[PDB]
């Protein structure tokens, strides 16, 4: 699978047919042809097939909430036979054991995966107290942690991960994304160096590979906390060895609009520049203006921006919802990466209820790369 | 008076009476009976009768700027028994004589105390020229001032005490709070190092000795704000004898809900545990938590408030005048002090047009203390 065999073969076999005197039109420029193909390389990556091969050398322990639901079901079988991750599944064990049947599932309970019963377990007295003494003073009584731990899958994940006994968790399957965030937020706590969090979705384009953030975290970002988006956003696309190409998207190009909107944009790009200067971005543009590379040279000689972007970062929520839910429809192609939760301490991602089998699988596959390291 | 007798002579004689077989009911946890009986002698204290006897110890001046009112005159009669203060009343020397005679009091004229004619005095130049150079750059001219000293007896008497002729000051018999503080303030100033002012009015209720703060002054208090007010209280409840215990109430049940308003009383108990953290305070809570230790330790067992809360924060005027007005007429008894200001240079208190004639003599009394200092 290695992008480079097209970089050197194509173009050494074509050298070797012009010498042979058999090529009937000569690609004089060979080094636009190099750039040609070396393009081709960019647009589309893989990007998963390093990721779940990461995953069968050390699969990790995840925790899956809503473990009744049938996707769920689906896509633990799937990560039992690629040997991907230890699943732990959250849920009443009888009708878990129950839609498997249906579902003709091989997975066996005990063996191939093991269950916590959320309404019974060993493991309830410490729980709820070690949720208690995070959130006595946000709002949770006494009373009232017991009583999610028994009815609130996601609660019960998080602390697991917290303790250590579980090294991820994927949720979201079932319920608003704000709710399980919330969650996960008092929680596991923000990453050290980052004080807001991003969420980040991800659709194979005819421009190519692209990212767009963010999607649910925040419904208005302001300057700084785009600002801690994009270098988080550009560190993670990098561990997929995309090379980053960051486009700040608002409805002014390049200063056609002073309203606060467009003036927010430009900030952050002060602030990302001096923070780390390596990462390639210009902003504010259009959305054409980024992904078509006529376009920009034509507003923007000079622009450090250079070919189609893959990471776009959007203004406030609204437009990335938005933009992300159209595009989606208007792409029809593999589901690649859901939404990645950028910024919290612990490995964990939130999903929609739309979220398809391979998108949970694709995604606990991420989560388990990210718990190799610490 | 003295508190340590009740706390010493109970046990020893319940041990004399266990020794000799007398005692039907043995008490096995001494140490707890030791507990309830240092809680009863800390709820019910006579801090008003070490300042009566500090007062007579050394009396000070004392002006009353509201001289003709008849609530003063009693007032100033018994402080002339009592030999607390040396009292300075200003206003019209004839209807002071002459309600004088009416109320049927023994006091007399340029003897047991001195009346300063509005209408007449000999050092009036020095008077509004003086107030001019403080008032000239807050728009009072000098007509204005002039006919200010004369028709405004709180501004004759702040004059003095700036001055030094007389050491202290007792008013707002008449009038809104606002009319007597906006000329302490700007005559006076703010207390070194300290840039707000806080209103304390006491009660005896059941639960204890109890303060309520920020009762006239300010309408809606910053953080900081709220923070040097609660520190200022505590340090003058020290002074009454009173351990300070604080509790910041709000609508909100450690943080319960998220508002702007508990958002408030949560950053000043982070500003008053670092300027100050031997301060025992805890909020947010609920009113009855900081009353009934019960409900607190049953929803914050770790709370580091320990039995009855005796200095009450609130988070708004608005609430706070309610709470106190509503609370005067079902606590029964208690006379106490009366709006006591705080964060003022100079020694002044402004009261409360119903304020009874046993809160004038109180609150003179605690002005004198306050002399004795600096």
């Known amino acids: 699978f290695d992008p480079r065999l097209i970089v050197k073969i194509a173009p050494a076999v074509?050298?070797?047919?012009?010498?042979?005197?058999?090529?009937?039109?000569?690609?004089?420029?060979?080094?636009?042809?190099?750039?040609?193909?070396?393009?081709?390389?960019?647009?589309?990556?893989?990007?998963?097939k390093p990721i779940f091969s990461q995953a069968r050398k050390a699969p990790k322990r995840v925790v899956l909430p809503e473990g009744e639901e049938a996707r769920v079901l689906h896509a633990t079988q799937e990560l039992v036979t690629l040997g991907l991750a230890k699943p732990i599944l959250i849920g009443r064990p009888n009708v878990i054991e129950m839609r498997i049947q249906k579902l003709g599932l091989q997975i066996k309970a005990g063996v191939d995966f093991e269950i916590v019963n959320n309404e019974s377990d060993p493991r309830f007295k410490e729980y709820w107290t070690e949720y208690f003494q995070i959130m006595k003073r946000r709002g949770v009584t006494q009373e009232q942690a017991q009583r999610a731990l028994i009815s609130n899958p996601t609660?019960?994940?998080?602390?697991?991960?917290?303790?250590?006994?579980?090294?991820?968790?994927?949720?979201?399957?079932?319920?608003?994304?704000?709710?399980?965030?919330?969650?996960?937020?008092?929680?596991?706590?923000?990453?050290?160096?980052?004080?807001?969090?991003?969420?980040?979705?991800?659709?194979?384009?005819?421009?190519?590979?692209?990212?767009?953030?963010?999607?649910?975290?925040?419904?208005e970002p302001d300057a700084e906390e785009l600002a801690e988006i994009t270098l988080m956003a550009a560190e993670t696309v990098r561990r997929f060895g995309i090379e980053p190409r960051v486009a700040l998207l608002s409805h002014s190009n390049f200063g056609s609009s002073d309203c606060p909107s467009s003036s927010k944009m430009r900030q952050a790009l002060e602030l990302v520049r001096e923070r780390a200067p390596e990462l390639m971005i210009d902003g504010e543009?259009?959305?054409?203006?980024?992904?078509?590379?006529?376009?920009?040279?034509?507003?923007?000689?000079?622009?450090?921006?250079?070919?189609?972007?893959?990471?776009?970062?959007?203004?406030?929520?609204?437009?990335?919802?938005?933009?992300?839910?159209?595009?989606?429809?208007?792409?029809?192609?593999?589901?690649?990466?859901?939404?990645?939760?950028?910024?919290?301490?612990?490995?964990?991602?939130?999903?929609?209820?739309?979220?398809?089998?391979?998108?949970?699988?694709?995604?606990?596959?991420?989560?388990?790369?990210?718990?190799?390291?610490?």
Chains 1, 2 share one sequence.
């Open 14 to 48: 074509a050298k070797a047919a012009m010498e042979s005197g058999v090529a009937t039109r000569p690609i004089a420029d060979f080094d636009v042809y190099i750039d040609k193909l070396t393009e081709f390389v960019y647009k589309t990556n893989l990007f998963m």
């Open 155 to 219: 609660v019960i994940g998080a602390i697991m991960v917290q303790r250590g006994e579980a090294d991820a968790m994927i949720c979201g399957t079932v319920g608003d994304y704000h709710e399980h965030f919330s969650v996960v937020k008092n929680v596991f706590g923000y990453r050290d160096g980052v004080h807001t969090a991003g969420a980040m979705n991800a659709l194979l384009l005819p421009s190519g590979n692209t990212f767009i953030a963010d999607t649910y975290v925040n419904d």
């Open 285 to 374: 543009m259009h959305g054409d203006a980024a992904l078509v590379e006529a376009i920009r040279n034509d507003r923007m000689p000079d622009s450090s921006l250079k070919g189609s972007a893959n990471i776009l970062v959007m203004p406030n929520m609204e437009a990335a919802r938005i933009s992300y839910n159209l595009l989606r429809v208007s792409s029809s192609e593999g589901v690649t990466v859901g939404p990645v939760l950028m910024g919290v301490a612990k490995p964990v991602h939130v999903l929609t209820p739309i979220a398809s089998v391979r998108r949970i699988v694709n995604m606990v596959a991420l989560a388990v790369v990210e718990a190799q390291t610490q």
